[PDB]
Design a protein around this nucleic acid. Structure first.
Ligand SMILES: [Mg+2]
Ligand SMILES: [Zn+2]
Lengths: 14, 55, 94, 1112, 147, 56, 221, 170, 102
RNA sequence: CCUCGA
DNA sequence: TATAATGGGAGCTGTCACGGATGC
DNA sequence: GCATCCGTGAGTCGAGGG
């Protein structure tokens, strides 16, 4: 959907 | 020869590369002083063609 | 209305064939300088100059009038194309 | 000439200032006359108080702003293509919370455009108007659910872009749902976040049968406000981590944050009046002592449940009611864009507060004004409501300023505009004119403020009524909104009055828009005037009550298209509004106080007032308007003339002695004429041109630039290659055409030379050069020439140069030259004329005088209108205008016939008899009896039943004259028209649509870049579009070659079109067409889409339409 | 049309309706390669079925299909026509996947190509007609007569 | 009296019987005389030509 | 010889309802909701209306303007769709040889269903004029032969015959039953209505059909 | 978009014959400009084509004999007139042009109905068919006087109007 | 730069491709130069065409044209001079090539 | 885009 | 080239009819 | 089988103003 939200989630994994 | 039919079909990466006269490797259009096209950019005469007739 | 348009429509099986006949004949007349006309000197369409009556420059007016006389022959596959071209160039040079 | 006015209605109040909707709105938004500390929290002051303080130095706060004086006057602004604006400064203080250090400074935020006296603007040298916008007012509404009868939807609506719309519905499963940003969730959750408990909601909402049961969910009451808040934050934000402070922030910004959510002041008022509550702020809830506190939601749900159950005193809402639609005027729209630019400035302020030295920061180091500047610049240059001002005539501008649009930013997108928005709602009465709207796509979406109407501080439109108590009509006039008006019984303005008492036992009145017959005891108010129902333009139509509305629309609209004429006249029949329109449009110049006129000049009037002070009024003379019509003023006083306050000094454009002069009074015959007025065409007499009727001045502006190039400079010069003295005759030493010269199409206005480029001489050029032994010059002729179909007399030249005082141009341009060309336009064949009753047509024939129908005394008629235009148009007002015009033509007088209270048939007949005496007894004393032709026409008229048999010829001619008809002789035969003909004076205007501007032709010309098809438009020497439907026409005729020609040889087959032009100039037949270039463009664009498009032959083997040039 | 006083001949409506009925749907493939539910043209299925009946095979069971004017125009054989109508993306993707050949039968296709349309003076029925005077006609007749 | 329908039928019948050349000549003649006579006919519109019947 | 009466009766201008509004009453008007106001405008444009009457009328005036405005778009769109379905339909041959035809009925069932009554003249003309008979018809001692293009007189005769009970339906060649591929043949189409004679092969007949249906589109109320 | 085309306001042309239309002189010059150049060469008006074009470039360089040449150019030819919207095929029709002074196209009374044309400000576009085939099509198939009956109904389409009807009725 | 689709590009003509008038003008120029070259001898017309570069696109030096005709560079220069001279005479006489010089 | 005209 | 700095920010929405996937 | 969300369409030609 929203790419920056997706990237921020993937970053919040580590 | 006279045109009779018109066909439309998917294009293979090989077909596409066969259309191509060169790869556009830089996101450059024209030079800020000379106003001429940049090498390997979107307007390069090396790929697309001469800007002036027979020159 | 174009003079005698009803008879012209009588001559063909489809009005568009009339149009094709007339246009090809107008092209013949223009290409050969009207030297190939089937029109007698008195049947020549005339236009009123400031000096006096001169010939009509309009090849379509001509071609229609020619068609009304019966002296023209129209139809499909009456002669090979290049043969008609060369024979007209022979009888009427450009 | 004497002016007789009709009508018995005495109007208590004059029309309000007609541009006040603009001027007062903008004054309120700016408050520039108010000392800062006394300013209210409205306007740009409100924008400042919304943005500031800015926090997280640590704090930046706002003290006050101020507006300076404009850098340049309005005339100079029009000259130099500037904006008429004032510098804006704001006093800000930076405060470090820890250091306590306080640094305060007056920072410069850029310029704000200023409104002129008449309510317009000057943006980049062009006058513009900010059009008011109509929209749904903020508030709480209740509508019937269209899906489920008996169920209703509650809607909470804030101001545009001040928060989301919220819906409350009662689901088929019984639970009450809230929808926000297209997200349905149970309302009980948010109710719990508000801090409500099941006990409070059960005692509040329990009285409604079975409804509160859908509100009871135990899993919701089992969690404290914190957990329910996190629950809602997860329901509204999938994927975002549910941190407590983040949920508080989001929900606060959604409902309680006044910097983000804002009902109007009107939104708050309407919510309060509807739900029976009182609001502390303008949000739906508050953040108080760490917890959310409810304002709006619970009353809304109470009202919704009550409307569903059917409990009395609860009703659905009509969203088209003018009590639920409001107007956003210029001040509000500009303040909104100011607020947006300020928000950007504050985001940049915080971004700067995080970076940079924390110790050393000023207000100036923190604030970048550029985004605010940008917001103002875009609102005034490119907004939809910011329109190129229509100043064709003064009424054009006044009407433009009183417009109301339903489109625009936050407005209805078209095709979302059905019948309801476009309807005239009963509440339009007295507020929005029911006739003045565009025909076509915009119908109903652009409307006009009624003449007496006013927009209040909440943005609702109010109309005046007279207080009536016990059959007595006071002079107290109360301005009501539609909501207030629906409370009363309002009698019609024409109700018979003896003194101030009602004289009819049956009175026509309105109750909630419904017409009702009522006793004087029941009358609560009364209309002020019929004028109050119509716009300013409709109010200019005499005998409006006799014109069907669909043509009154056209006459109304077309008055704004009338061209100012050099001999313009006021109408011989007027409505009485003709002078207020001149006064309020600031057309004419007036006397400021009593005094004596000292000097009178073509250019200036000097007046000495009662103070002894000497005031000098300069006159605008031959100025060009937005539409190219001459705007100028002429002195109407004389030296030594004594003048009182408010007396006419100079007449503006289209003004005769202070009266609105949109056209000319012409002598008209209503009869067919040899087909030359077939289907609304018009016939006119050459006599109209001889005496300069319908002649207008028009000024055109031409502009050219000389810039620095990479091949050398352009220059304005008189030295132009290959041009004779014949070509350069009217050019002065510098190369600009001389003032006063006559310029024709092809003539040079400004000589300019440009250095040639990419120059490779082709061998023909080299050989021709050697043959004629002439060097090819370095430069070439790029001069500005008169375009085809234009020309006139040069009346002005402006020249701006780089390196000259006060002059700085866009980078690279050395100089700019503007030439002004005036032309005098006589009426001609194809020009559009029209009257105030929607009768419009184009002049199709101009007859010499001796062919015009003429009266027996030798007077010929001015124009001949076809009677076939009248029946189905049903605009009989023009006929009454014509009869009264005949009467006034012979009595030498003019009239004022107010709409719905004006000249009736019997009084027109009296005037016509008085006129007949002048028209006939003069003859009978001059020694002439009745004429043979008149006798024959009288016989014909007797057969028509138009006169009574047995009366004398004079009695019968008078019977005809009383019907408006007269004997008329055909000027070609001298024989009479077999009938008596309607003849009289009619007011007729020349509209802006003149065949001079519209006639265009093209053989060949410029082609478009990508498509290689001709350009469009008269200015680009363009070609006509042969669209899909013209193609269908040609296909239907079966004209294959005509169509193929349209598609190839005439548009974008390059080889074809070149070969065709060469063939025709050689006298050869045209060559066969080939592939149109835009088909090749299509093929290459499909290849760009990774689709291979192959032209094949009958053996299915490819064919190359690119002739190998695209294959390796 | 009658209620508004418009006189309009039935045959125009009949032509449009005939285009609305252009297609059919397969109920049983029979011996064909077609599938149950496959939509195609009545003309094409009648051709296939006469080919299978003259071959002795089983004919395709098919049912008539009414589709409205938009859907009928988008289902036409010519992809140039359909793509220029609307749904340009959908039409072009399915045409490209199927490798469709446009035979330029109708008017829109040839307009798009700039070709001379197949109607009126561009009809194959009349466009090859020749005109000759009796002089040139007999002068060619003699040249045919000497050989 | 000659009106819209009868003149339409005249034009149609003339087309059928005499061809479009003659029908065009006929149409021009009808045009000429119609315009000529409508000029001198006395047709006009005054407010008194909209006759309120007493039956109203 | 009154001007309004003359213009109306001749067809040069005006219709009864407009003349009525000019002379008699103006009439009942609609509220914005489409509901009708109980009391009408009793005035004529000769007499002049009251401001209230004028206002009451403005509702319908505006609704009609908006109807026209929103209508022309739908008409144009419809025309384009009709063009796109029909554009390939051309008269391609002189006869496809089909033995199939349609039967235009001359009688329609009464709404009472009391009988089957005659159709209106114009309707029969619009279904029959210019068509080609697909079968011999013998009526009123006249033979209308198979292959005959029905003149207007042939149609009026067939109407007369139906009035005498001789024929209730006419068999006729029609584009519905033509078997010409990519279009239509000459006999199944019949007259080129613009020329009152059989259609020329090559006539772009589908475009003509689309334009014929679409052109009155903005008149339909 | 297309070459050899123009547009102007339409005006009623009662004196016109059914196959004619009034065409402004200057419109006609620009529309037929290549033919005019050719003819000006065919006569003494210009030594060559380029001189003739430079002669028509400026309005005060234009002299009388070029108008007579224009008359000799347009003889027998037709132009197409078009009114928008083009609802059916008679929104385009062919006419012999009669050169008029003034800037307004003159349209024949009997064709207005087919064009849905009146004279409250309507404007039409002119197109010049170029080839002998284009002119044959336009003069035969699209000429106004050859298209008298509706292709939709069969009834007369060019028929007496209200003004015409009024005199005949009277 | 700014966007062509602001459309804003539909007001932008094409200065590159020669117009129909320019194409026809160069056509008549080539035809009239050949008309005038025909009034010379074939050798002097060929010398002019080689010196102007018309035959192969570029202009030859006097030594190349002279070695092409087998003659001294002074001789080929004199032939070019007299050919140009006869051209100037014919042109002053018939005034046919004047208009094309702009 | 807007407004305007048909 | 070295103090430490560690998950964004804009968000008004008054149409309607069609095919088609998505769910209950 | 039947509600629901997504996507795609919704007159032409002009003119001007940008
Ligand atoms: Mg009109
Ligand atoms: Zn058939």
């Amino acid at each position: 959907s929203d790419p920056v939200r997706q990237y921020l989630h993937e970053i919040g994994q580590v | 020869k006279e045109v009779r039919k018109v066909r439309i079909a998917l294009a293979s990466p090989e077909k596409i590369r066969s259309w191509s006269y060169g790869e556009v490797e830089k996101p450059e259009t024209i030079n800020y002083r000379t106003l001429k096209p940049e090498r390997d950019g979107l307007f390069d005469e090396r790929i697309f063609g001469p800007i002036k007739d027979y020159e | 209305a174009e003079p005698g348009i009803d008879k012209l429509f009588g001559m063909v099986d489809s009005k568009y064939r009339l149009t094709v006949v007339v246009a090809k004949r107008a092209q013949q007349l223009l290409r050969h300088g009207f030297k190939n006309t089937v029109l007698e000197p008195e049947e020549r369409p005339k236009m009123q100059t400031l000096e006096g009556l001169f010939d009509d420059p309009n090849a379509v007016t001509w071609a229609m009038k020619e068609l009304l006389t019966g002296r023209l022959v129209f139809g499909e596959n009456l002669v090979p194309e290049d043969r008609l071209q060369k024979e007209m160039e022979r009888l009427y040079p450009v | 000439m004497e002016i007789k006015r009709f009508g018995r209605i005495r109007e208590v109040i004059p029309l309000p200032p007609l541009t006040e909707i603009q001027v007062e709105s903008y004054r309120r938004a700016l408050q520039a006359d108010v000392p800062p500390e006394k300013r209210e929290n409205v306007g740009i002051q409100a924008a400042f108080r919304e943005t500031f303080p800015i926090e997280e130095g640590l704090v930046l706060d706002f003290l006050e702003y101020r507006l300076g004086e404009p850098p340049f006057p309005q005339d100079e602004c029009r000259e130099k293509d500037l904006t008429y604006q004032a510098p804006l400064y704001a006093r800000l203080q930076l405060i470090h919370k820890d250091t306590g250090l306080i640094k305060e400074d007056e920072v410069f935020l850029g310029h704000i455009p200023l409104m002129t006296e008449d309510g317009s603007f000057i943006i980049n040298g062009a006058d513009r108007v900010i059009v008011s916008q109509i929209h749904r007012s903020p508030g709480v509404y209740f509508t019937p659910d269209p899906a489920r009868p008996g169920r209703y939807i509650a809607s909470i609506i804030p101001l545009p872009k001040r928060g989301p719309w919220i819906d409350l519905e009662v689901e088929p499963n019984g639970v009450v749902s809230m929808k926000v940003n297209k997200r349905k969730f149970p309302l009980v959750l948010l109710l719990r976040v508000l801090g409500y408990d099941q006990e409070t909601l059960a005692r509040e909402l329990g009285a409604y049968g079975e409804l509160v049961q859908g509100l009871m969910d135990e899993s919701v009451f089992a969690m404290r406000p914190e957990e329910a808040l996190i629950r809602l934050f997860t329901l509204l934000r999938p994927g975002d981590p549910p941190k407590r402070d983040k949920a508080v922030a989001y929900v606060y910004g959604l409902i309680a944050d006044p910097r983000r959510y804002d009902l109007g002041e009107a939104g708050r008022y309407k919510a309060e009046e509807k739900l029976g509550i009182r609001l502390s702020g303008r949000t739906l809830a508050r953040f108080e002592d760490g917890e959310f506190k409810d304002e709006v939601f619970l009353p809304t749900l109470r009202y919704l449940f009550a409307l569903t159950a059917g409990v009395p005193g609860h009703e659905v809402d009509d969203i088209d009611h003018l009590g639920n639609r409001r107007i956003r005027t210029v001040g509000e729209l500009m303040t909104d864009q100011f607020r947006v630019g300020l928000a950007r400035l504050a985001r940049g302020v915080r971004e700067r507060m995080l970076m940079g030295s924390e110790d050393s920061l000023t207000p100036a180091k923190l604030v970048n004004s550029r985004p605010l500047e940008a917001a103002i610049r875009e609102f005034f240059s490119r907004s939809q409501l910011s329109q190129f001002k229509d100043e064709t005539n003064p009424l054009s501008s006044l009407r433009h300023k009183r417009r109301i649009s339903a489109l625009g930013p936050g407005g209805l997108t078209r095709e979302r505009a059905g019948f309801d928005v476009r309807d005239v709602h009963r509440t339009h009465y007295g507020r929005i004119c029911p006739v003045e709207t565009p025909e076509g796509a915009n119908i109903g979406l652009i409307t006009s403020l009624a003449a007496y109407a006013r927009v209040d501080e909440l943005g609702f439109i109010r109309t005046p009524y007279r207080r009536v108590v016990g059959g007595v009509v006071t002079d107290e006039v109360v301005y009501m909104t539609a909501t207030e008006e629906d409370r009363y019984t309002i009698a019609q303005a024409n109700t018979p009055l003896e003194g101030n008492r009602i004289a009819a036992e049956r009175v026509v009145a309105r109750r909630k828009g419904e017409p009702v017959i009522v006793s004087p005891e029941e009358v609560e108010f009364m209309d002020v005037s019929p004028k109050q129902v119509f716009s300013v333009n409709t109010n200019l139509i005499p005998f409006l009550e006799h014109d069907d509305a669909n043509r009154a629309l056209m006459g109304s609209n077309m008055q704004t298209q009338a061209v100012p004429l050099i001999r313009a006249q006021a109408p011989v029949v007027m409505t009485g509004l003709e002078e207020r329109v001149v006064r309020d449009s600031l057309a004419a110049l007036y006397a400021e106080e009593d005094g004596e006129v000292a000097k009178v000049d073509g250019n200036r009037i000097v007046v000495r007032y009662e103070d002894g002070r000497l005031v000098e009024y300069p006159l605008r003379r031959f100025y060009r308007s937005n539409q190219g019509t001459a705007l100028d003023q002429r002195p109407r006083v004389v030296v030594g003339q004594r003048v009182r306050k408010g007396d006419l000094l100079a007449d503006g454009p289209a003004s005769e002695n202070g009266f609105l002069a949109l056209g000319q009074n012409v002598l008209v015959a209503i009869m067919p004429f040899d087909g030359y007025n077939f289907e609304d065409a018009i016939v006119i007499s050459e006599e109209l041109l001889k005496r300069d009727f319908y002649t207008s001045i028009h000024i055109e502006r031409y502009e050219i630039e000389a810039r620095d190039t990479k091949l050398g400079p352009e220059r304005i010069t008189r030295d132009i290659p290959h041009l004779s003295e014949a070509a350069l005759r009217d050019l002065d030493e510098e190369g600009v055409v001389r003032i006063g010269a006559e310029v024709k199409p092809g003539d040079i206005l400004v000589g300019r030379t440009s250095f040639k480029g990419e120059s490779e001489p082709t061998p023909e050029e080299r050989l021709l050069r050697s043959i004629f032994g002439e060097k090819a010059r370095d430069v070439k002729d790029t001069s500005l020439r008169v375009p085809p179909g234009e020309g006139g007399i040069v009346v002005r030249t402006v020249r701006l140069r780089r390196g000259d005082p006060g002059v700085e141009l866009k980078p690279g341009v050395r100089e700019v030259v503007r030439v002004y060309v005036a032309q005098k336009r006589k009426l001609q064949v194809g020009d559009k004329l029209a009257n105030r009753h929607g009768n419009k047509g184009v002049v199709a024939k101009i007859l010499p005088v001796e062919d015009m129908p003429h009266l027996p005394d030798g007077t010929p008629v001015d124009v001949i209108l076809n009677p076939l235009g009248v029946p189905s148009r049903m605009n009989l007002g023009q006929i009454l205008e014509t009869h009264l015009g005949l009467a006034g033509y012979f009595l030498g007088q003019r009239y004022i016939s107010p709409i719905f209270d004006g000249a009736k048939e019997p009084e027109i007949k009296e005037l016509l008899a008085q006129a007949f005496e002048v028209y006939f007894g003069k003859r009978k004393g001059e020694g002439f009896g009745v004429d043979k032709r008149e006798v024959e026409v009288l016989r014909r008229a007797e057969k028509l039943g138009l006169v009574t048999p047995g009366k004398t010829p004079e009695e019968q001619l008078k019977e005809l004259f009383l019907q408006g008809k007269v004997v008329l002789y055909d000027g070609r035969t001298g024989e009479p028209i077999e009938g008596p003909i309607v003849v009289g004076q009619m007011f007729i205007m020349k509209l802006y649509h003149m065949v001079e501007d519209k006639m265009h032709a093209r053989s060949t010309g410029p082609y478009s870049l990508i498509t290689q098809q001709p350009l469009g438009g008269k200015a680009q020497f363009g070609g006509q579009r042969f669209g899909e439907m013209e193609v269908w026409a040609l296909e239907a005729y079966g004209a294959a070659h005509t169509l193929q020609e349209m598609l190839t040889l005439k548009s974008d087959d390059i080889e074809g079109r070149n070969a065709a032009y060469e063939a025709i100039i050689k006298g050869e037949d045209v060559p066969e067409p080939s592939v149109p270039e835009s088909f090749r463009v299509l093929v290459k664009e499909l290849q760009a889409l990774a689709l291979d498009v192959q032209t094949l032959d009958e053996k299915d083997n490819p064919v190359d339409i690119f002739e190998g040039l695209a294959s390796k | 049309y009658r209620a508004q006083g418009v006189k309009l001949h039935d045959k125009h409506i009949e032509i449009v309706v005939r285009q609305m009925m252009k297609y059919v749907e397969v109920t049983d493939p029979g011996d064909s390669r077609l599938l149950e539910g496959q939509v195609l043209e009545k003309w094409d299925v009648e051709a296939l079925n006469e080919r299978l009946i003259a071959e002795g095979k089983t004919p395709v069971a098919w049912k008539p299909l009414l589709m409205g004017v938009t859907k009928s125009a988008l289902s036409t054989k010519s992809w140039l026509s359909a793509a220029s109508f609307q749904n340009t993306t959908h039409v072009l993707t399915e045409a490209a996947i199927a490798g469709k050949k446009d035979e330029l039968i109708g008017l829109k296709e040839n307009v798009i190509l700039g070709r001379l349309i197949p109607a009126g003076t561009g009809s194959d029925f009349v466009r090859f007609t020749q005109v000759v005077d009796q002089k040139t006609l007999k002068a060619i007749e003699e040249a045919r007569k000497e050989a | 009296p000659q009106e819209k329908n009868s003149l339409k039928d005249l034009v149609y019948q003339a087309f059928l019987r005499l061809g479009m050349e003659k029908t065009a000549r006929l149409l021009d003649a009808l045009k000429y005389y119609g315009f000529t006579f409508s000029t001198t006919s006395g047709i006009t519109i005054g407010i008194d030509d909209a006759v309120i019947p007493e039956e109203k | 010889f009154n001007p309004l009466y003359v213009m109306a009766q001749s067809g040069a201008r005006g219709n009864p309802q407009q003349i009525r509004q000019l002379c008699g009453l103006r009439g009942l008007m609609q509220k914005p909701s489409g509901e009708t106001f109980e009391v009408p405008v009793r005035s004529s444009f000769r007499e002049g209306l009251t401001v209230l009457e004028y206002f009451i009328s403005s509702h319908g005036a505006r609704k009609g303007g908006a109807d026209t405005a929103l209508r022309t778009a739908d008409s144009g769109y419809l025309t384009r769709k009709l063009v796109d379905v029909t554009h390939e339909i051309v008269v391609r041959e002189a006869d496809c040889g089909t033995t199939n035809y349609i039967s235009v009925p001359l009688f329609q069932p009464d709404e009472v269903t009391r009988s089957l009554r005659l159709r209106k003249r114009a309707d029969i003309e619009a279904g029959l004029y210019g068509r080609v008979l697909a079968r011999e018809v013998e009526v009123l001692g006249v033979r209308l032969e198979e292959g005959r293009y029905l003149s207007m007189d042939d149609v009026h005769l067939l109407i007369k015959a139906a009035e005498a009970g001789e024929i209730q339906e006419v068999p006729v060649r029609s584009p519905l039953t033509c078997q010409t591929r990519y279009g239509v043949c000459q006999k199944c189409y019949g007259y080129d209505l613009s020329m009152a004679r059989p259609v020329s092969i090559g006539e772009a007949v589908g475009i003509v059909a689309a334009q014929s249906i679409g052109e009155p589109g903005t008149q339909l109320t | 978009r297309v070459d050899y085309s123009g547009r102007s306001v339409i005006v009623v042309g009662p004196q016109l014959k059914l196959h004619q239309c009034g065409l402004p002189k200057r419109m006609a010059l620009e529309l037929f400009k290549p033919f005019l150049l050719k003819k000006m060469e065919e006569k003494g008006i210009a030594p060559n084509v380029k001189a003739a074009r430079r002669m028509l470039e400026r309005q005060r360089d234009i002299k009388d004999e070029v108008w007579d040449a224009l008359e000799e150019v347009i003889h027998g030819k037709v132009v197409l007139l078009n009114r928008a919207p083009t609802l059916h095929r008679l929104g385009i029709q062919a006419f012999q042009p009669v050169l008029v002074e003034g800037q307004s196209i003159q349209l024949h009374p009997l064709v207005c109905e087919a064009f849905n044309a009146d004279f409250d400000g309507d404007q039409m576009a002119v197109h010049v068919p170029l080839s002998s085939f284009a002119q044959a099509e336009a003069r035969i198939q699209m000429l106004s006087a050859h298209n008298l009956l509706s292709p939709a109904s069969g009834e007369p389409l060019a028929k007496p109007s209200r003004d015409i009807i009024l005199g005949l009725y009277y | 730069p700014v966007s062509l689709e602001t459309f804003y590009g539909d007001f932008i003509p094409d200065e590159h491709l020669p117009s129909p008038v320019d194409a026809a003008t160069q056509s008549l120029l080539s035809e009239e130069l050949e008309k005038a070259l025909s009034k010379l001898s074939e050798r002097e017309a060929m010398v002019l065409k080689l010196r102007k570069g018309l035959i192969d696109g570029r202009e030859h030096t006097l030594e190349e044209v002279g070695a092409f005709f087998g003659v001294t560079r002074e001789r080929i220069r004199q032939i070019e001079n007299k050919a140009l001279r006869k051209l100037k005479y014919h042109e002053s006489r018939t005034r046919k090539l004047r208009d094309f010089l702009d």
